[PDB]
mmCIF file of C-alpha atoms (C1' of nucleotides) in Angstrom:
data_model
loop_
_atom_site.group_PDB
_atom_site.id
_atom_site.type_symbol
_atom_site.label_atom_id
_atom_site.label_comp_id
_atom_site.label_asym_id
_atom_site.label_seq_id
_atom_site.Cartn_x
_atom_site.Cartn_y
_atom_site.Cartn_z
ATOM 1 C CA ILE A 125 22.911 19.433 -29.278
ATOM 2 C CA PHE A 126 19.105 19.479 -29.535
ATOM 3 C CA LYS A 127 17.681 18.426 -32.906
ATOM 4 C CA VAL A 128 14.121 17.802 -34.041
ATOM 5 C CA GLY A 129 13.064 14.160 -34.096
ATOM 6 C CA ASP A 130 15.662 13.071 -31.518
ATOM 7 C CA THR A 131 14.688 10.615 -28.772
ATOM 8 C CA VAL A 132 16.230 12.519 -25.860
ATOM 9 C CA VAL A 133 16.290 11.258 -22.273
ATOM 10 C CA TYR A 134 14.717 13.543 -19.662
ATOM 11 C CA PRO A 135 14.750 12.666 -15.935
ATOM 12 C CA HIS A 136 12.812 11.151 -14.238
ATOM 13 C CA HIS A 137 10.451 10.308 -17.108
ATOM 14 C CA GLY A 138 13.046 8.465 -19.202
ATOM 15 C CA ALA A 139 12.574 8.716 -22.957
ATOM 16 C CA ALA A 140 11.009 11.955 -24.229
ATOM 17 C CA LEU A 141 10.522 12.605 -27.945
ATOM 18 C CA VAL A 142 11.068 16.211 -28.991
ATOM 19 C CA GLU A 143 8.506 17.966 -31.183
ATOM 20 C CA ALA A 144 9.684 21.542 -31.778
ATOM 21 C CA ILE A 145 10.833 24.788 -30.139
ATOM 22 C CA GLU A 146 8.911 27.991 -29.412
ATOM 23 C CA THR A 147 9.972 31.596 -28.857
ATOM 24 C CA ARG A 148 7.602 32.075 -25.880
ATOM 25 C CA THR A 149 8.847 35.596 -25.238
ATOM 26 C CA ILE A 150 8.786 36.218 -21.483
ATOM 27 C CA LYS A 151 10.040 39.397 -19.809
ATOM 28 C CA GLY A 152 10.678 40.592 -23.356
ATOM 29 C CA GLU A 153 13.100 37.684 -23.894
ATOM 30 C CA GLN A 154 12.379 35.129 -26.614
ATOM 31 C CA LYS A 155 13.608 32.369 -24.309
ATOM 32 C CA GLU A 156 13.815 29.278 -26.475
ATOM 33 C CA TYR A 157 11.442 26.629 -25.093
ATOM 34 C CA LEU A 158 11.920 23.214 -26.679
ATOM 35 C CA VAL A 159 8.998 20.814 -26.266
ATOM 36 C CA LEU A 160 9.255 17.167 -25.179
ATOM 37 C CA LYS A 161 6.521 14.524 -25.078
ATOM 38 C CA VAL A 162 6.764 11.356 -22.981
ATOM 39 C CA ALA A 163 4.715 8.308 -23.953
ATOM 40 C CA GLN A 164 4.308 7.258 -20.305
ATOM 41 C CA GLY A 165 2.300 10.197 -18.937
ATOM 42 C CA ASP A 166 1.285 11.783 -22.250
ATOM 43 C CA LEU A 167 2.458 15.179 -20.988
ATOM 44 C CA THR A 168 4.381 17.959 -22.725
ATOM 45 C CA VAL A 169 7.392 19.574 -21.032
ATOM 46 C CA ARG A 170 8.856 22.806 -22.415
ATOM 47 C CA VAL A 171 12.423 23.471 -21.248
ATOM 48 C CA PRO A 172 14.993 26.216 -22.008
ATOM 49 C CA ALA A 173 17.933 25.030 -24.098
ATOM 50 C CA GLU A 174 20.393 27.334 -22.323
ATOM 51 C CA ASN A 175 19.819 25.583 -18.969
ATOM 52 C CA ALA A 176 18.363 22.361 -20.387
ATOM 53 C CA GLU A 177 21.443 20.415 -19.288
ATOM 54 C CA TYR A 178 21.107 21.980 -15.829
ATOM 55 C CA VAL A 179 17.756 20.251 -15.303
ATOM 56 C CA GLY A 180 19.314 16.932 -16.320
ATOM 57 C CA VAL A 181 18.057 16.221 -19.833
ATOM 58 C CA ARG A 182 20.448 13.892 -21.655
ATOM 59 C CA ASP A 183 20.547 12.386 -25.129
ATOM 60 C CA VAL A 184 20.262 8.671 -25.881
ATOM 61 C CA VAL A 185 23.276 6.988 -24.301
ATOM 62 C CA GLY A 186 25.499 4.951 -26.597
ATOM 63 C CA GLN A 187 26.765 1.402 -26.299
ATOM 64 C CA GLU A 188 29.485 2.381 -23.812
ATOM 65 C CA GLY A 189 26.842 2.936 -21.143
ATOM 66 C CA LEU A 190 25.124 -0.259 -22.275
ATOM 67 C CA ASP A 191 28.172 -2.430 -21.609
ATOM 68 C CA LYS A 192 28.810 -0.428 -18.428
ATOM 69 C CA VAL A 193 25.360 -1.260 -17.058
ATOM 70 C CA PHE A 194 25.782 -4.911 -18.033
ATOM 71 C CA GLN A 195 29.108 -5.122 -16.185
ATOM 72 C CA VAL A 196 27.580 -3.327 -13.192
ATOM 73 C CA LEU A 197 24.751 -5.854 -13.237
ATOM 74 C CA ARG A 198 27.634 -8.303 -12.799
ATOM 75 C CA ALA A 199 29.167 -6.375 -9.871
ATOM 76 C CA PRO A 200 29.099 -8.598 -6.731
ATOM 77 C CA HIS A 201 29.918 -7.924 -3.065
ATOM 78 C CA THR A 202 27.246 -5.335 -2.247
ATOM 79 C CA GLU A 203 26.434 -4.594 1.401
ATOM 80 C CA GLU A 204 23.875 -2.178 2.841
ATOM 81 C CA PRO A 205 23.345 -0.588 6.266
ATOM 82 C CA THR A 206 21.537 -2.772 8.779
ATOM 83 C CA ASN A 207 18.519 -0.497 9.199
ATOM 84 C CA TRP A 208 15.849 -0.824 6.522
ATOM 85 C CA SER A 209 15.108 2.911 6.650
ATOM 86 C CA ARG A 210 18.672 3.961 5.848
ATOM 87 C CA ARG A 211 19.021 1.628 2.861
ATOM 88 C CA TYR A 212 15.571 2.625 1.589
ATOM 89 C CA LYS A 213 16.544 6.301 1.776
ATOM 90 C CA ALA A 214 19.863 5.574 0.063
ATOM 91 C CA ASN A 215 18.312 3.727 -2.872
ATOM 92 C CA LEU A 216 15.487 6.274 -3.163
ATOM 93 C CA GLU A 217 18.044 9.080 -3.420
ATOM 94 C CA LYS A 218 19.946 6.927 -5.916
ATOM 95 C CA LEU A 219 16.812 6.682 -8.064
ATOM 96 C CA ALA A 220 16.117 10.407 -7.668
ATOM 97 C CA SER A 221 19.626 11.275 -8.868
ATOM 98 C CA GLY A 222 18.600 9.972 -12.292
ATOM 99 C CA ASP A 223 22.024 8.437 -12.908
ATOM 100 C CA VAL A 224 21.462 5.344 -15.037
ATOM 101 C CA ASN A 225 24.157 3.398 -13.184
ATOM 102 C CA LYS A 226 22.743 4.184 -9.737
ATOM 103 C CA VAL A 227 19.169 3.245 -10.650
ATOM 104 C CA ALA A 228 20.437 0.090 -12.370
ATOM 105 C CA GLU A 229 22.352 -0.946 -9.257
ATOM 106 C CA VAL A 230 19.299 -0.233 -7.091
ATOM 107 C CA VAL A 231 17.062 -2.267 -9.406
ATOM 108 C CA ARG A 232 19.386 -5.257 -9.537
ATOM 109 C CA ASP A 233 20.058 -5.296 -5.787
ATOM 110 C CA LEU A 234 16.380 -4.982 -4.900
ATOM 111 C CA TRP A 235 15.366 -7.633 -7.432
ATOM 112 C CA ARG A 236 17.959 -10.128 -6.211
ATOM 113 C CA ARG A 237 16.828 -9.528 -2.622
ATOM 114 C CA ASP A 238 13.117 -9.883 -3.488
ATOM 115 C CA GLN A 239 13.797 -13.064 -5.459
ATOM 116 C CA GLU A 240 15.978 -14.212 -2.556
ATOM 117 C CA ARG A 241 13.215 -14.274 0.034
ATOM 118 C CA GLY A 242 10.408 -11.809 -0.798
ATOM 119 C CA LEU A 243 10.109 -8.503 0.992
ATOM 120 C CA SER A 244 7.150 -6.133 0.953
ATOM 121 C CA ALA A 245 4.915 -3.848 -1.099
ATOM 122 C CA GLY A 246 6.883 -0.589 -0.877
ATOM 123 C CA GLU A 247 10.072 -2.218 -2.118
ATOM 124 C CA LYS A 248 7.959 -3.889 -4.802
ATOM 125 C CA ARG A 249 6.677 -0.482 -5.937
ATOM 126 C CA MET A 250 10.182 0.979 -6.016
ATOM 127 C CA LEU A 251 11.443 -2.015 -7.998
ATOM 128 C CA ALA A 252 8.554 -1.806 -10.466
ATOM 129 C CA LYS A 253 9.064 1.910 -11.123
ATOM 130 C CA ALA A 254 12.836 1.657 -11.458
ATOM 131 C CA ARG A 255 12.668 -1.431 -13.688
ATOM 132 C CA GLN A 256 10.071 0.292 -15.886
ATOM 133 C CA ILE A 257 12.231 3.368 -16.431
ATOM 134 C CA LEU A 258 15.311 1.206 -17.022
ATOM 135 C CA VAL A 259 13.576 -1.019 -19.575
ATOM 136 C CA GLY A 260 12.311 2.014 -21.471
ATOM 137 C CA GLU A 261 15.759 3.601 -21.442
ATOM 138 C CA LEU A 262 17.404 0.394 -22.690
ATOM 139 C CA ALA A 263 14.716 -0.134 -25.339
ATOM 140 C CA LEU A 264 15.616 3.241 -26.800
ATOM 141 C CA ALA A 265 19.309 2.666 -26.028
ATOM 142 C CA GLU A 266 19.345 0.034 -28.774
ATOM 143 C CA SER A 267 15.897 0.850 -30.249
ATOM 144 C CA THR A 268 15.111 -2.761 -29.337
ATOM 145 C CA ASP A 269 11.489 -2.027 -28.283
ATOM 146 C CA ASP A 270 9.934 -2.345 -24.830
ATOM 147 C CA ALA A 271 8.958 -6.024 -25.066
ATOM 148 C CA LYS A 272 12.339 -7.175 -26.357
ATOM 149 C CA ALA A 273 13.982 -4.735 -23.924
ATOM 150 C CA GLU A 274 12.138 -6.427 -21.059
ATOM 151 C CA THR A 275 13.236 -9.841 -22.319
ATOM 152 C CA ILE A 276 16.891 -8.786 -22.674
ATOM 153 C CA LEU A 277 16.709 -7.393 -19.144
ATOM 154 C CA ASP A 278 15.316 -10.765 -18.048
ATOM 155 C CA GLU A 279 18.122 -12.735 -19.702
ATOM 156 C CA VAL A 280 20.957 -10.449 -18.600
ATOM 157 C CA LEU A 281 19.894 -10.408 -14.938
ATOM 158 C CA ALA A 282 20.388 -14.192 -14.985
ATOM 159 C CA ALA A 283 24.170 -13.880 -15.330
ATOM 160 C "C1'" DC B 1 -27.006 51.143 47.465
ATOM 161 C "C1'" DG B 2 -30.766 51.657 42.443
ATOM 162 C "C1'" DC B 3 -31.046 51.664 37.388
ATOM 163 C "C1'" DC B 4 -29.185 50.023 33.081
ATOM 164 C "C1'" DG B 5 -27.030 47.167 29.608
ATOM 165 C "C1'" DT B 6 -25.241 42.792 28.147
ATOM 166 C "C1'" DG B 7 -24.721 37.720 28.176
ATOM 167 C "C1'" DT B 8 -26.860 33.245 28.849
ATOM 168 C "C1'" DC B 9 -30.519 29.623 29.169
ATOM 169 C "C1'" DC B 10 -35.116 27.468 28.081
ATOM 170 C "C1'" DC B 11 -39.276 27.264 25.337
ATOM 171 C "C1'" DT B 12 -41.782 27.070 21.027
ATOM 172 C "C1'" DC B 13 -49.054 20.965 19.173
ATOM 173 C "C1'" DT B 14 -50.788 15.821 18.166
ATOM 174 C "C1'" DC B 15 -50.809 11.747 15.012
ATOM 175 C "C1'" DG B 16 -49.411 9.549 10.551
ATOM 176 C "C1'" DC B 17 -46.921 8.041 5.577
ATOM 177 C "C1'" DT B 18 -42.795 7.378 2.315
ATOM 178 C "C1'" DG B 19 -37.526 6.150 1.412
ATOM 179 C "C1'" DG B 20 -31.583 7.019 1.294
ATOM 180 C "C1'" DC B 21 5.378 3.573 5.865
ATOM 181 C "C1'" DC B 22 8.446 -1.109 6.790
ATOM 182 C "C1'" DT B 23 11.288 -4.650 9.822
ATOM 183 C "C1'" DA B 24 12.347 -7.962 13.698
ATOM 184 C "C1'" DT B 25 10.890 -10.911 18.249
ATOM 185 C "C1'" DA B 26 8.251 -13.250 21.259
ATOM 186 C "C1'" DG B 27 4.143 -15.146 22.582
ATOM 187 C "C1'" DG B 28 -0.881 -16.798 22.264
ATOM 188 C "C1'" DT B 29 -4.515 -19.096 19.395
ATOM 189 C "C1'" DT B 30 -6.645 -22.634 16.523
ATOM 190 C "C1'" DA B 31 -6.940 -26.264 13.140
ATOM 191 C "C1'" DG B 32 -5.882 -30.596 12.254
ATOM 192 C "C1'" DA B 33 -4.804 -35.307 12.925
ATOM 193 C "C1'" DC B 34 -3.770 -39.372 16.356
ATOM 194 C "C1'" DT B 35 -5.117 -42.106 20.195
ATOM 195 C "C1'" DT B 36 -8.191 -43.183 23.726
ATOM 196 C "C1'" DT B 37 -12.738 -43.842 25.638
ATOM 197 C "C1'" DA B 38 -17.681 -43.533 26.573
ATOM 198 C "C1'" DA B 39 -21.341 -44.505 23.380
ATOM 199 C "C1'" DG B 40 -24.557 -46.464 20.011
ATOM 200 C "C1'" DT B 41 -25.601 -50.946 17.619
ATOM 201 C "C1'" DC B 42 -26.535 -55.965 16.040
ATOM 202 C "C1'" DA B 43 -26.796 -60.969 16.427
ATOM 203 C "C1'" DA B 44 -28.076 -65.034 18.927
ATOM 204 C "C1'" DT B 45 -30.552 -66.927 23.175
ATOM 205 C "C1'" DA B 46 -33.055 -68.364 27.271
ATOM 206 C "C1'" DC B 47 -37.060 -67.952 30.008
#
DNA sequence: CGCCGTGTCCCTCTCGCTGGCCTATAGGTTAGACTTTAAGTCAATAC
């Protein structure tokens, strides 16, 4: 499941290159602690393989998720609760879930709304963060690189 | 009704120098140009 040199996805930092694994015996138990490095924060995260999936670490998603997110980007007829607070909480929880589909839907909806009439700074921050993580994830999804990943995001949002 | 202990308040000189969250509504304000008017100006003239 976990192999050296694999570009594994760890939430909510997106891509996270593995380096190695260490015994790190604690309580007399050589609990395996595999080490990930994320290029965004330049931090190392050591996680246990036995419950690694419990935290939410996932491998690079294939092309099935790629076409899924494209189709979802072409999913119309979205309505939100009237109050701004409720919809903000909903999309923030959607981002926190780490599900690629949920964050993609949040990003697209917020971007279409912002481009519709322009909103605010907090929504802008949410959109920037979510778009950043999505572009990184897609870049590694097809190893298409961050710049070309941003451009493909920019063409596909056009529909 | 005295003596004692504790808490509180006021005082502690003069002069001088250098520098260190977000959204939606309704209402008031001003700026900007248009139109009017009192105002400043020039040219020729007569005594």
